[PDB]
Inverse folding.
């Protein structure tokens, strides 16, 4: 992740492992929340 | 009333073929400086 | 008529082919074509002047009484889903055909003077012809698909032209913002283009009004649901014409070349952002809640862009914030309904902004003589005052362009501008008295920009005293730097100004509106009185005329100060000096926010879904090093497992 | 007509790939083996255009080169080939991009006897996937590009080649087994043991069986066409690679995972489609928004466009699972147009990196001052991938938005949100493409220019391969019935296969 914080507009500072899990549950929850939408909203 | 793709492809094939066999002969920089050398992404 | 009108698609494809060739001549033959700067400029200009020869006869044939002529060619077909792409020659379309090729031939006459010291002289005429062919297809367009093929093309030509120099870091970031901010409107246009093909079923403007009005009263569509459709189409022209949410790219579009600013305020802005809503009036007049949205976001921008033009030190950044407001002054004319007057203030805007922009470039190429190439703001180093005291013909023509935008007695605007002030005090006078207050403020910054830099003394002594350039000593002070290639275009762009000194007059306003009928023959107007028009026009030429007397007295005292305004209204002056504090809302929230959302989609990629794949390869390698310890030598232990499995399979298989 | 045409095109490179160790004169680097491999590419592309302009006989649904040769009667398999409308655009594309991938493989002097062997063997192992009408030959041809593309990434690759090469052969051969499993599940259903792709379609299946075969096919086709949970093999295998290899991965090899979705998940299993089709368009929407924000946040240059290729793929899912003749005609046109666009991007990343030796995108700036023809070419190819009109990126996505929200299948609160969500990719693709252009070319701040980056040029051969690929990008984008007439009548039966089932 040190090569992911390359010296351009990145390194927001939230590359901590406490943030990685709480960013995952919203992102992987939105795809799962959209798939479970689809089988009941489309037909 | 559609332009067919067969007369526009058969007339574009033998210009594409004769231009690669010419443009292969013309190149620069890939034989003189070329510090990549052998290993093509090292 | 038949070789004039069946070959009418040649007006887009002629100046495209002038850039197709030099684009093929610069990418393959750049050793000769970079040297062939002078012939390839005249070669590219020849296909534009022939395209001027089509339109000047395609429009003059239209006002004699010829019918509109349509053509449609199938573009992408499927089962029961056709896309048609052709053209129309419409008196609205043929009027815009003249404007976008007259000012394009003009700016290519201009371009031989502002450069030919620049090595990018050959490429600049390749991009300038790439603008026009992308632009001349937008005006002849019959469909909502066909206006969208050339919507995102002219933003591509606007991206390439702002980043023309591309060695400035400032012109780098300016080019990208002009593509992204227009793409939000293109995100809006694409939603309504599919959204209106969903509801109506056909992509043409004429077939969209009759089909939308068929479902809104029958009961298939809702009055609230179909209102958000035509709002989304309108979100397109708020980007290109720089309305309220999307206007941040115009101070930075002045980081490009000065010829381009004349063309991106006469072709992509006053044309593109207004031609679409003028063509979509079959949809908008059946929706009352949409037209009140258009006029409110137009009238706010007439106020919003006007005050940032005040205390603006840069000349091109003051003209850029002018045409934010003047386009905003015009889109609300399409929003209150009175749109034929909104279309005849379009022609005098495009021919005078280019008069004001190319006139401003005569100042910058003059001021490069005494000052180095870094500052282009109001004058320091022999400060502001005098340029017309040197008596140039370049300086008297950006006054005449400045004069006919406020509402002065003897010139234009008295015929076209104040017509939508009387039609806007009919319905909602609360949100539309705001245009009257800034009507004296549009008169302010225009004449604030005139006699600050054209009346006084501006050649004597250096305050900063650092030019040190042979390219500045050869920049020809005493404004004759403006060569022979500004004597024609600064004059010949004023020869349509006396034509609209004759047309669009109180007898030819009636005859030109008679050309500009809407989608139907009916014309909706509240009331027009004989006596009441005289004071509504007579008190309104005052607020223009006495609006500059407070500017004739403010910026002719040397300091910008009547009493207690040197210590200014800093609640409000910090807004206009720091440019509305609107660039920083879009930057600290959207630019940082998408630099914060995107980063943690990358780290959930590299660590969660890459963590599972790198765990299947880890629990199989440590399974291998767990049964590698099953064998340990000691061959008697191997004889146990042979004997234990004999005991196992005879308890396994008897039940 | 009697002459086996598709059997020639499949086997003529692999027969002539074996004659590479017998080519004489290894006097230094490999010059004569570079010219033999190029010329044997071109005379097979001439064999595709001879077989197409004389024998294809378009606006007819079905295969027109039908050659069912007997191979092994015990297993029941034959050597059957055939070109329909869902494949004959892609046989033509494969013979076009590979012949440029030989020509873009010119500076290689590492192992040139081995490079052009596998690339000619991969040129046969790609046409063989689109052409065969069988199931044990289709599983053969799917994994026939398994060992040459392990070796193309491992020997000529960046750093972390070996971590990228063995993550890829284990993830694709670890997913190709569902082709054999689901290909055997339909073969033994009923009473016949037929393996042809026609009788397996013309067989009637049960509904509960069809959802097991479709979910077996979905993982086997969600890996190659990177449906975004199953995608992690790609940006390593595409991130650490050379430009002549990369044109065969992103240009063509992703298209086989989308070609096979149209053939074997829409034709053969229609009532399996109509049950789990709205999961595809939601996996198509997230394919665009995830892969455009993942592309923006990355600073490795070859890895930015590698994640971008997942995003352009995201309209193939919306195009397939929309049950409209313009949606499916916009997905096939998306696969052709991304191959021509993605090859023209992925060549110039190698063309940039061969001069500046970095890919890091922070030590760059002012590259457009030294090389201009590289800058003028990398602008026209990145503008092609913006879905900008006048090029084939926009017309391929124009039919998908129109084709999806004109279908009488979904409900209206679903179709509004998907069109609103897929069009966020319209905003998102200029964010990272133009910021890639800006942080490399635009600017005064150059490199150290002493230790690294000693050279800059633009070879007059390299200007051809972009101008060779930008001709059919624009030529399709200005008249898309140059391509839509090839597959009008065969796509019109796949949609006729899924319309009669649709209320289910």
């Amino acid at each position: 992740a040190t090569d992911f914080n390359r010296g351009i507009m990145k390194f927001d500072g939230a590359d901590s492992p406490a943030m990685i899990a709480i960013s995952a549950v919203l992102i992987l929850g939105f795809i799962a929340g959209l798939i479970w939408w689809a089988l009941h909203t489309a037909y | 009333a559609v332009i067919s793709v067969k007369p526009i492809l058969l007339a574009m094939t033998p210009v594409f073929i004769l231009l690669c066999l010419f443009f292969g002969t013309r190149n620069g920089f890939y034989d003189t400086d070329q510090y990549h050398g052998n290993g093509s992404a090292h | 008529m038949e070789p004039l009108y069946q070959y009418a698609w040649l007006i887009p494809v002629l100046p495209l082919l002038g850039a197709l060739i030099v684009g093929f001549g610069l990418i393959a033959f750049s050793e000769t074509t970079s040297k062939l700067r002078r012939p390839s400029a005249i070669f590219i200009m020849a296909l534009m002047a022939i395209a001027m020869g089509h339109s000047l006869t395609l429009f003059w044939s239209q006002v004699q009484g010829h019918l509109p002529y349509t053509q449609m060619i199938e573009w992408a077909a499927a089962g029961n889903l056709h896309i048609a792409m052709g053209y129309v020659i419409d008196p609205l379309a043929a009027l815009m055909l003249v404007i976008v090729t007259t000012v394009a031939f003009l700016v290519m006459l201009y371009s031989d003077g502002y450069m030919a010291h620049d090595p990018g002289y050959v490429r600049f005429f390749a991009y300038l012809s790439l603008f026009g062919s992308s632009m001349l297809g937008l005006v002849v367009s019959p469909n909502l698909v066909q206006v969208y093929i050339f919507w995102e093309l002219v933003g591509m030509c606007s991206y390439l032209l702002i980043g023309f120099w591309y060695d400035r870091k400032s012109a780098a970031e300016a080019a990208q913002k002009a593509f992204v901010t227009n793409r939000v409107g293109d995100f809006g246009l694409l939603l309504g283009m599919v959204g209106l093909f969903w509801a109506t079923g056909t992509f043409d403007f004429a077939g969209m009004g009759d089909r939308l009005t068929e479902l809104v009263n029958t009961g298939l569509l809702s009055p609230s649901l179909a209102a958000i459709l035509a709002i989304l189409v309108f979100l397109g022209p708020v980007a290109k014409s720089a309305q309220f949410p999307l206007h941040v790219w115009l101070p930075d579009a002045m980081e490009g070349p000065t010829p381009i600013s004349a063309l991106i305020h006469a072709a992509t802005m006053v044309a593109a952002g207004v031609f679409l809503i003028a063509r979509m009036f079959p949809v908008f007049e059946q929706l009352p809640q949409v037209m009140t949205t258009i006029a409110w976001t137009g009238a706010f921008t007439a106020f919003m862009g006007a005050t940032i033009a005040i205390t603006q030190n840069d000349i091109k950044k003051s003209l850029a914030y002018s045409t934010i407001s003047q386009l905003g002054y015009m889109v609300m004319g399409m929003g209150v309904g009175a749109y034929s007057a909104g279309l005849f203030h379009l022609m005098t805007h495009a021919y005078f902004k280019a008069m004001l922009f190319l006139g401003s470039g005569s100042v910058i190429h003059s001021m490069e003589g005494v000052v180095g190439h870094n500052p282009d703001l109001a004058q320091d180093m022999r400060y502001m005052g005098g340029l017309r005291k040197y008596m140039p013909i370049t300086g008297a023509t950006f006054l005449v362009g400045c004069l006919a935008i406020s509402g002065v007695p003897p010139f234009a605007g008295f015929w076209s501008k104040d017509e939508i002030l009387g039609a806007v005090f009919h319905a909602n006078p609360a949100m539309w008295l705001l245009t009257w207050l800034t009507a004296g403020l549009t008169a302010f910054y225009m004449f604030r920009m005139y006699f600050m830099t054209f009346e006084g003394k501006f050649r004597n002594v250096p305050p900063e005293r650092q030019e040190h350039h042979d390219h500045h000593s050869h920049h020809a002070a005493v404004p004759h730097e403006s060569p022979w290639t500004m004597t024609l275009p600064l004059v010949v762009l004023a020869i349509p100004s006396t034509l609209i000194g004759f047309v669009g007059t109180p007898f030819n306003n009636l005859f030109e509106v008679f050309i500009h009928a809407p989608g139907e023959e009916k014309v909706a107007e509240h009331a027009v009185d004989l006596t009441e028009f005289l004071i509504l026009g007579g008190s309104s030429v005052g607020i223009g005329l006495m609006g500059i007397t407070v500017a004739y007295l403010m910026y002719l005292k040397g300091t910008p100060s009547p009493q207690a305004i040197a210590k200014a209204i800093q609640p409000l002056y910090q807004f206009s000096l720091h440019k509305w504090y609107f660039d920083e809302l879009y930057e600290a929230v959207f630019i940082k926010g998408c630099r914060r959302l995107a980063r943690q989609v990358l780290e959930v990629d590299y660590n969660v879904v890459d963590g599972v794949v790198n765990l299947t390869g880890f629990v199989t390698m440590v399974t291998g090093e767990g049964l590698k310890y099953l064998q340990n030598g000691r061959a008697q232990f191997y004889a146990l497992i042979v004997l234990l499995a004999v005991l196992g399979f005879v308890i396994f298989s008897v039940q | 007509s009697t002459f086996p045409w598709l059997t020639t095109i499949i086997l003529f490179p692999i027969v002539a790939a074996l004659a590479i160790p017998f080519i004489p004169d290894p006097t230094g680097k490999g010059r004569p083996i570079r010219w033999y491999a190029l010329a044997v590419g071109l005379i097979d592309f001439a064999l595709i255009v001879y077989a197409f302009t004389n024998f294809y006989d378009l606006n007819t649904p079905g295969m027109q080169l039908w050659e069912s040769y007997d191979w092994i009667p015990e297993i029941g398999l034959r050597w059957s080939v055939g070109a329909d409308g869902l494949s004959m655009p892609l046989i033509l594309l494969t013979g076009f991009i590979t012949t440029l991938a030989i020509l873009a493989a010119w500076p290689v002097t590492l192992k040139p006897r081995l490079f052009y062997f596998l690339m000619l063997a991969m040129y046969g192992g790609q046409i063989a996937v689109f052409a065969v009408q069988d199931m044990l030959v289709f599983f053969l041809a799917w994994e026939l590009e398994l060992i040459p593309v392990y070796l193309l990434l491992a020997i000529w690759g960046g750093h972390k080649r070996q971590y990228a090469a063995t993550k890829f052969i284990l993830y694709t051969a670890g997913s190709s087994l569902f082709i054999l499993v689901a290909g055997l599940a339909m073969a033994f259903y009923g009473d016949t043991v037929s393996f042809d792709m026609q009788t397996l379609a013309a067989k009637d299946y049960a509904l509960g069986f069809q959802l097991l075969v479709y979910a077996g096919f979905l993982v086997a086709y969600g890996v190659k066409l990177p449906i975004v949970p199953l995608h992690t093999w790609l940006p390593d295998a595409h991130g650490e690679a050379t430009a002549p290899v990369h044109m065969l991965l992103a240009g063509i090899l992703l298209k086989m995972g989308g070609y096979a979705l149209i053939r074997m998940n829409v034709d053969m299993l229609p009532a399996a489609h109509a049950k789990f089709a709205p999961v595809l368009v939601i996996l198509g929407v997230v394919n665009i928004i995830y892969a455009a924000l993942t592309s923006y946040a990355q600073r490795n240059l070859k890895r930015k466009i590698a994640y971008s290729s997942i995003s352009h793929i995201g309209f193939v899912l919306i195009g397939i699972a929309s049950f409209t003749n313009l949606g499916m005609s916009g997905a096939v046109l998306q696969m052709v147009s991304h191959g021509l666009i993605g090859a023209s991007l992925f060549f110039l990343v190698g063309a940039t990196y061969d001069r500046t030796h970095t890919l890091i995108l922070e030590e760059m700036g002012g590259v457009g001052q030294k090389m201009k023809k590289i800058f003028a070419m990398f602008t026209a190819c990145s503008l092609a991938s913006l879905a900008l009109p006048g090029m084939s990126g926009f017309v391929a996505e124009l039919m998908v938005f129109i084709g999806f929200a004109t279908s009488d299948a979904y409900s209206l609160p679903f179709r509004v949100i998907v069109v609103f969500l897929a069009a966020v990719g319209v905003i998102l693709t200029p964010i990272y493409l133009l910021s890639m252009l800006r942080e490399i070319f635009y600017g005064p701040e150059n490199k150290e220019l002493v230790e690294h980056e000693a050279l800059v040029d633009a070879e007059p051969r390299e200007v051809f391969i972009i101008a060779c690929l930008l001709v059919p990008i624009i030529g399709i984008g200005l008249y898309p019935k140059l391509l839509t007439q090839i597959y009008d009548a065969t796509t019109g039966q796949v949609i006729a296969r899924a319309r009669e089932v649709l209320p289910t």
User: Anything to note?
Assistant: The CA atoms of residues 109 and 216 of chain D lie 42 Å apart. Residues 325-356 of chain D form the longest helix (32 residues). The radius of gyration of chain D is 22 Å.
